[model samples]
Target: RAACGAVLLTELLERAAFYGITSNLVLFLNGAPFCWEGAQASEALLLFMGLTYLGSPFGGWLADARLGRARAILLSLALYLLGMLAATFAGLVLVGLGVATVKANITPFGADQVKDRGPEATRRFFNWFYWSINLGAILSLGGIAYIQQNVSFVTGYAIPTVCVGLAFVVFLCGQSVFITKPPDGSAFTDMFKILEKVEDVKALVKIVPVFLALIPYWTVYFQMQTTYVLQSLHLRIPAAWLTMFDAVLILLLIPLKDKLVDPILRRHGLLPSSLKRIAVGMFFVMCSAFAAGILESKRLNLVKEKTINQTIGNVVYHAADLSLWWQVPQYLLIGISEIFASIAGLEFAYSAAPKSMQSAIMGLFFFFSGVGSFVGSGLLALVSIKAIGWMSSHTDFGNINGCYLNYYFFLLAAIQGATLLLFLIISVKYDH
Candidate 1:
């Protein structure tokens, strides 16, 4: 465990910092005085997220071609630290770029530390790795969000800044033990030229379906930031803290899934393979969205009753009288789905790609999140169309207790349902 403790600490602190901001960003943007309109704020947040993932391929390329993993990670932490210190829109840009770089390399770097150890060792590495991140997220969403909500934004942002600093110190302390791999020359250049090889091309094509299935997974997963948090605003608890449920559940469920539930499923035909696990995860995500839809519809009734009337600027908004506990099911479902879909997706990508192109393929997998954000953004635009009445300058279905928000959730549910069905029918079968 000491072998990878530094990496795990780095992951935990980095994730805490990342989620602290991202989970609460829409609220920050849409806060009183600044009060960005919902549609405008949501678009910006999603696009920012899209840009963050867009940087991953570049980050991976840099790790493989220019900087080695250790150096890339160091640079990433430094950039992230600088961004956190800046505390402005420019800071957001720097943070996004830094996070993109860090996300691209850190997991692989941690995994590499135990290379050739054995399958069990590797498996333990990731389980701990995933646990570390979710644990970090738990603190961020609950503790950090509570601080931000109760105390001040400056205090909230500063905590993550401190966490990032601590991560840097932890990483530097491990310099002696960490495995630092040298760059593989011009892999990105050769990667672009790989189309010439038919076998490699076919291999790449086969993974396309998997990636397609995952884009909507992200579309559903990331709602915690934009839509879900907004929905939580009228609740008694901090809106930011409400998103903590996923992290909390993730912390509890990862072990339960791996140690208990998975073995039981393995005994039966259920979840017999990786694809099946991922498919099951997608089903959970779909169910979460559906739960969200039902709650949103119920919340609209509260809005109609004038339960959450507030004047921000020209726009009068209504909050829901709905119990915050209603959000628990969706968050719990998402967490369960993460243990299934997200973890499986990472493992699947690693095993499926060639060793020579593994990093790039991993980057490609991250790019799916970016694509999901873009798709969500486009959907936001379409739904915001004035004619649709989903979003209007005046009180409309979209603005009232998030009336159209329910429709959005239902739409996501439908998309993910179809995605799961398709995945089941044409999914790539993988070995255990």
Candidate 2:
């Protein structure tokens, strides 16, 4: 594990991209001074990920074609480095936007390190990989927060850029070890083009149903950043650092779920197949969101009462004085759903796509996440003024005592639950 830097990839990506993601979150939240809210950061996802609908095709083509996954990954990292440096030195918001762009493509690009296998095996490896990222996220979120509080933003960005560079160097050294599919470079491999070959086209059709089923999990699973964190802002925690609790939850939960829970379920035949688990995960995804909705609704009621009560009590309060801890259950639930949805989803993508299309198909995984992200942003933007009034200016539901992010989470959860139901029906009845 140490020799191949398997353990280190997560660390490397986290350190390099931490501040970049942080900056985006800070920006997308409209400088709300809260965690999550990278919704405005969609441009970053679009550019770096080229993930707008058919965008990942380009990324896939690059990996599948001339550069191969290894080179493709290196270039992406370099782009991130440039973006970070630009961000670190530039005076304007433009620099920050550039960093956001770079943050978009980094993940699926990082996923290039592994080869795809059948669904079950792919599922297991991804379980490890997801844990790796959660572990890294655990470190970077809290670490960057500390540095921003004590040191400076400059210090926070500098360290991650360095780590990214080191990761590229390590990748270069290990490039030869990676097994890859031969790419179709400088030639057309678009859906139309790929479809031109009947045999290959026939193969690609197999995964469509699988991808269809996954959108719900993604829509809900992705709330950790936009919806979940946005909701967390209203609840009172002692310090801003409690924002890292979501990542911290995953850092703790993934291993437990995979090691203790998953195995037992599997051994006892209580475990569903990979596809089933993913569907079940989507239900968990809904559960988390529903939990958010309930809590948020309570928070909304609390805020309403707070307004009424404020006239009675002369005690002044800061947002910090609000007990934010109630958001913990929502955050923890999201973390649990992440293990099921994310880990399972990755494996599903890798397995579902034909080997030749793995990189491109993997990009589609982010595609769903991006869609969910865009929807999240759009959802907030389109909320009725009345609903908006219930939420803080932070675009999150809650006031000092609580947040109505539960409402946000709950609606998304319904969507996720519906998606899960539809997905299950499709996978079970139509996938064949």
Candidate 3:
């Protein structure tokens, strides 16, 4: 019971991380920078990553030795439900992150429960699992957009909690058939033994090489929530068609990758054990970021001096006032990256973990973001990008306004490039 409770806390934190990332970027636009509102809405997402990072290894602890895989999932799901409820009530931004931490902690642990379910089943499950998560996100990004835009702020937050609540109940209803039985090893002593083994550590260590390098991917990947969303709100965009961009892009690309890209990669012996696709995914992520930067620069150049380099300040602003359509291509590129990096990245992490530690592996992926966000946040928090010359002409919301993130994106690209170098080195030497 004690062990299970500990695992529950972990699961609860993980769920928060998943949901925490959703509203951070777009929702923050309604208020000024440094307003408590933006912090509560956006910054809390870090807790999700932090808790997930901490939980990843513990997943291995349970899967290989301690609590066992089946029990881990049961406990994780229970806590995921409760942690989200905390977010519903937590008044402070940090408290939101705390609740989120609990929810975010659950995913990797849950995945761990299914880690060793035969190789064929493992691959099949990972594929479906990634698909369902994105399917779930479709509701999050889409449903919340309406709730947030039409209804009250409370309604927006409250509604997502309800979906999570319903999901928890549904998850429990059929969980018995889903969970794996306990593995044969000792939960305690065997864990100690694995820790002592160099190969086990190598598997984990190899994951690190992808860490910050994935930042460029995420920088662009994250903009779907951040820059692009902010652009749609402030500038003019396709409106309801905006929501369809991500949805359509995801639907189109998933099959394209599988039917065309996957098969060709396989034929060339680049499919199953290759990190080339993951690397290629990184390139797409870069393109998304680049496209966004270019479009935004153009918009800023065109805006009135007072509003230059600013997020469209008032939600009530109409489409005719701005060329919001110009933002679509960048958003489209971001959606494409989602298919390539975000979805494919999840697959890569699941496949890379030690046989008994898939849940932990997913957790590891989440945790890396904690590290990346810190890198990004630290970069964001510490360094302010000052625009110059023609850039100065773009300053609309004040110099410190929306233009600041231009630095964030640029820094992110450099980070991704550095990380990719490390990943290439590690993949060549140690990856499966």
Candidate 4:
């Protein structure tokens, strides 16, 4: 139990440190030194986020085939701290690599510590694990974001760095209590030898389509950090702080789902499979996009009627009278979606994998999420082109006020709706 507690604390601190950078990254890029256009800032954010997940497969391979989970995580933590200290684009690269390595191994490592527990215990652990992650996010997005916006960026960044440093110490202290596992043979190599009909490979094949279908869900999920933050900028409030709502909602909803919702559903024999939970989550994402579309349309109309362009230092923005609270519904919807889709995906990935291949399967789960970010980046690039002109106005220093930002949300809704349908069809035929 102490070992598990240590692992959970490490995850919380690591996430707090990572989100401390990402939550305010777009604003950093769009303001002072970088001064990038909105599309440019968002694309850079997505790409950075993309690389973090894309590297996971390699991290998994290293853990499962070379270094054991503990050593891999220790190495990654050292690199993560160095990256935090550097705080440059090169630093971002290192952080991404470090995060990928840690993320792929950490949860599986935590689960390993409790391997003797039954399935229900493992499921409960995931709920708490996810709860800890969002708790970390809430801490950073609420407090660090406020500090970064109103105080000093250096101080804000330093806090998370300190947290990570402490996390490293905590993890090292728990070394004796951890249930350490040796490196198994390569899971990837087994896949390549699939002519032999390996059982693990067969299990992997069953989950691949599910992962593919989730790409669109992740694309929508990434919006909460990118486009949603951008939308919040058009209001009078601090942009990054708005994301705290999603984190807070997750902190609230996870226990509600686990304790109240799941029991009610099970009593009625209406408890859904993981795939069904994922589909329900996708539906909520669609609703979130739709809600954003409506809000943007309303805000745009107000912008057309009584808008003011204000210049604060080097930054210029157009604001309407719309309350920042208008964004709460969308954030709330996404939060609910995550309680269903993201956690279920994690649980499914861990539960589906053979013991020898756990990390590799988890890595693949994140890889598809990375692909989803890339897809979002690609779409942003496409729409920001001169001919499309849907994302930003070339004349207004790339502010999105004059662009068809509402239409973009609608487009996301349509995409999510289509993908949700695809997921449902796939689920119907899925062999479990």
Candidate 5:
């Protein structure tokens, strides 16, 4: 119990540190000395986010074969702290490496502590684990974001650095109570051995399509860090703080779902399977994108009517008569979607994996998220082409008002819609 609490707290602090940097990263890069264009800043963010997830396999391998999870996490935490202190592009690279290592190992490590308690206990553990992550996100997105915008970047960055340093210490204190699994040989070799067994390989194969189907959800969800934040600049609010709603809603809804919703569904014999929950999440994500498209259209209409466009340096100040609260529904919808899709996906990944391959399978779960980021970036590139010109006006001098942002949102919605259909078809045949 003490070990799980320590691991959870360590993760919470790590998330606080990570989100503190990322919540305001685009604003940081686009303003002051760096002064990158909107698209450039977004691409850079996507690349950084992508690397953090994409490198998970390596982290998993290191934990499975070389260092055990505890050792891997400690080493990664040190690298993470160093990156936070550095606070530059070079630092981001190290942070990505450190984060991937931790991401791949930590949940499985936490789950290992309560593994003997049976599946229900493990599922509950994941919900709380995800809850802790969003709680940490709330701290960064709400508080650290405000500090970054109102105060100095140095002060903003310094807080997260200290938080992560504390995380390192907190995690070490848990070493005594932890159910530390020894390094169990190569995860890849274990995976191949699994392939040789028919039932084991079948279970893995069934989950792969579910993972692929969820990518569209991730591709759209990541817009919260990029286009969604950029869109907030036009409204009357601090840009980074708008994302706080997503975290806030998650904190509220997780308990609501667990305590209120699941019991009701169970009574009616209407409780959904994991794949069904994921499918529902995909549907919600589509609605969120569609809602965003509508909001963008409304904002563009205001811009057209008022002609109140102002741009200074990299910041665009459009004095539209739109309130920041208009974005809440989209964020709320996304939060709801994450509660279903993201958490269910994690539970599914853990349940579906063979004993020795848990970390590796979790790594693959993250790797799909990386793929989603890359897909989002690729879509941005495709639309940014002069021939396409969807994002032609998203520059330092030009504003989002002049770009086809609504259409971009609509495109994402359509992509997610198509994926949801495919997911339903695949899920109907799923063995689980």
Candidate 6:
């Protein structure tokens, strides 16, 4: 119990630091001489976010093979500190590696602390652990956004740096309480060992389709940090504050779904199963992209009607004239989709995997973000061509030279719509 509490506290503080750093990163990259356009900034953050997951396998391997979870977590915190303090592209790379190390071991370490409490208790413990993460998320979303927008960038970075520093300190305070679970030879050997057996290979194959479906979900979902922020810039909204919409809707909707929607659906011959929830989440995300597409079209139309233009260094461009609140529905939908898709998908990854491969499988699941980011990279590459610029624009500020943002949204929505259909078809064929 003491170890669980300590790890929980450490995670809360760490996330407070992490979310604080990332929430305003797009805007930060846009400021001053570092004024990167949508494609460049999105690619930068996407790469950073992607590597954070890609490194999970290495960290997971290290923890299970050499360093115990306790030490691995400590090492992760130290790296996080260095990243936060440095505040450069190199710093983000360090942060990615750091997050990978912590994610791989922290929860498992927390779980080890409660081994005597039985399986049911373990489930409850993890649930609370997740809630603790959200608590930190909410705090940082509001607190850090306000600070970065109003105070200064230094303070913004400083807040999270201090939060992570305290987390490291708190983790050390419980050094004696933690019961370390050192690496067993079986973990690494078992990972590759299973591939020789046909049944294990078949089971692994069954997991692939689910993972494939997840990539598209993340491809769209990650836009909250990239495209979504860019869209809001035109509407005169604080991009950081826009993030709160997701958290707010999530808090409001979870109970509604549990008490109201689930019961009604169950009564109507619908069970709130994970696949159904995931499909519905995909549906909502598709709707979000569609809404965004329509909204952008309208904004462009307004630009054409008003012909609003700004000149910077003798360069002129048109702007979008629309209320920032128009963005709420898309964000709200994403929140709803996450509650259904992301949550259920995580639970599915655990329940579906062979017990021995649970950590490895979870790492594979997280790797979907990297896959999705690469897909975004591909799309960005395609749209960047001058010939195709009329179809989509990855512009910065008000500059829309030879490009259309609406087409990109429509393209994404169409792709997402098709993916959702395929996902549902695959889910139908999949056995429980």
| Maximum-lDDT candidate | 4
Score candidate 3 by TM-score against the native: 0.68
Residue pairs in clash, model 1? none
RMSD of each: 4.6, 6.0, 7.0, 3.7, 3.6, 4.9
Model 6: residues with Cα > 4 Å off, grouped in runs: 1-8, 23-50, 82-93, 107-135, 145-157, 172-182, 185-202, 236-239, 255-270, 307-321, 391-402
- What 10-residue stretch in candidate 6 is worst by lDDT? 310-319
lDDT comparison, 2 vs 4, better candidate: 4
**Alpha-carbon error at 44 in model 4, in Å?**
7.9
**What is the alpha-carbon lDDT of model 4 when measured against the actual structure?**
0.80
Winner by TM-score between candidate 6 and candidate 3: 6
> Candidate 2, TM-score vs. the true structure?
0.75
Assess every candidate by TM-score. 0.80, 0.75, 0.68, 0.86, 0.86, 0.77
Q: What is the per-residue lDDT of model 2 for residues 202-244, given as tens digits with 9 covering 90 to 100? A: 6667666677666545545554466554444444544344446
Clash count, candidate 6: 0
lDDT (Cα, tens digit) per residue for candidate 6, span 41-93: 76777777778879876777676656766787899899988787773677778
Please state the error at residue 206 of candidate 2 in Å: 3.8
Say what the RMSD of model 2 is: 6.0
Using alpha carbons, what is the TM-score of model 6? 0.77
Model 5 spans with C-alpha error above 4 angstroms: 23-47, 84-92, 141-157, 187-198, 236-239, 309-314
**What would the per-residue lDDT of candidate 1 be over residues 137-243, giving only the tens digit for each residue?**
88766677467668966675678779899999999888888877777755234654644345665677687777887787676566534577556655433223445
Predictions in order: lDDT: 0.73, 0.56, 0.51, 0.80, 0.79, 0.70
Between candidates 4 and 6, the lDDT winner: 4
lDDT of 1 at 318: 53
Superposed by TM-score, candidate 2 places the C-alpha of residue 278 at a distance from the truth, in angstroms, of 1.5
Q: After superposition, how far is residue 154 of candidate 5 from its true place, in Å?
A: 5.5
* Model 1 alpha-carbon miss at residue 386, Å: 4.1
